[PDB]
């Protein structure tokens, strides 16, 4: 709340 998003 919020993000950390597009994998590895």
């Amino acid at each position, epitope marked *: 709340r919020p*993000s*950390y*998003i*597009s*994998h*590895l």
Partner: antibody
Framework: EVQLQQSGAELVRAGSSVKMSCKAS????????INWVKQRPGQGLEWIGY????????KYNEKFKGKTTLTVDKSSSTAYMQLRSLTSEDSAVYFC??????????????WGQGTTLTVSS | DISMTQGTSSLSARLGDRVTISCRAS??????LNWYQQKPDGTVSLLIY???RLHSGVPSRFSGSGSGTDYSLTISTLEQEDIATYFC?????????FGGGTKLEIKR
């Protein structure tokens, strides 16, 4: 456009081994991890393990380590899963799935149709 | 490991009902919970991820909530295509684990 096409059904005798594939497309193969899930008609789903195409790093579920080996081919965007010393306990459908990073950890956003393995003579 | 349990194995409901599928972790998973929908045939897709609240591109009628050890998926206004099997999955510790699943079926 994110697609994961897995191998075709498999037929193998006990004591033998098998290697299935999961071809990815529509995204950057090395930017996401691949997980493998096991589904026997009874139980639910079991997490086998995970691999990072980028570095080849692999983490296994203790129960499945020893008989399972996850590999990957960066030149064809394909992840492979080899099962050894097969028994009827290995008869199930196997899925590969992509992982994505939100907050602290991961989740599987895309899955393949699955690969059916039947161990018998 | 962290055991995930879904009290109901099969659940009955009529189209248009507000459906609730539960799931409980054996320990606190800090909202690291995901929901997947498996079909009789086209088989598997993600609906909600993280603490059961984030969407993915699925209809708004799918909502998720929970915290600590108890979480749930609510399908407001159930539709025909929604008839399927639902699995929860904790992403807090390793190995990753799923609940036994919950298969919805039509009341008659």
């Amino acid at each position: 456009e994110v697609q994961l096409q897995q191998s075709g059904a498999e037929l193998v005798r006990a004591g033998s081994s098998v290697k299935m594939s999961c071809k990815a497309s529509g995204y950057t193969f090395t930017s996401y991890g691949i997980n493998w899930v096991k589904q026997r008609p009874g139980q639910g789903l079991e997490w086998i393990g995970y691999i990072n195409p980028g570095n080849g790093y692999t983490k296994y579920n203790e129960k499945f380590k020893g008989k399972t080996t996850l590999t990957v081919d960066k030149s064809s965007s394909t992840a492979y899963m080899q099962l050894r010393s097969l028994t009827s306990e290995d008869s199930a459908v196997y899925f590969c799935a992509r992982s994505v990073y939100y907050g602290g950890s991961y989740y599987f956003d895309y899955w393949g149709q699955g690969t059916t393995l039947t161990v018998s003579s | 490991d962290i055991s995930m349990t879904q009290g109901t194995s099969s659940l009955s409901a009529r189209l248009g009902d507000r459906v609730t599928i539960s799931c409980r972790a054996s320990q606190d998973i800090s909202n690291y919970l995901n929901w997947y929908q498996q079909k009789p045939d086209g088989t598997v897709s993600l609906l909600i991820y993280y603490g059961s609240r984030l969407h993915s591109g699925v209809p708004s009628r799918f909502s998720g909530s929970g915290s600590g050890t108890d979480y749930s998926l609510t399908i407001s206004t159930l539709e025909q295509e929604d008839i399927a099997t639902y699995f929860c999955q904790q992403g807090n510790t390793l190995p990753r684990t799923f609940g036994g699943g919950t298969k919805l079926e039509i009341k008659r």
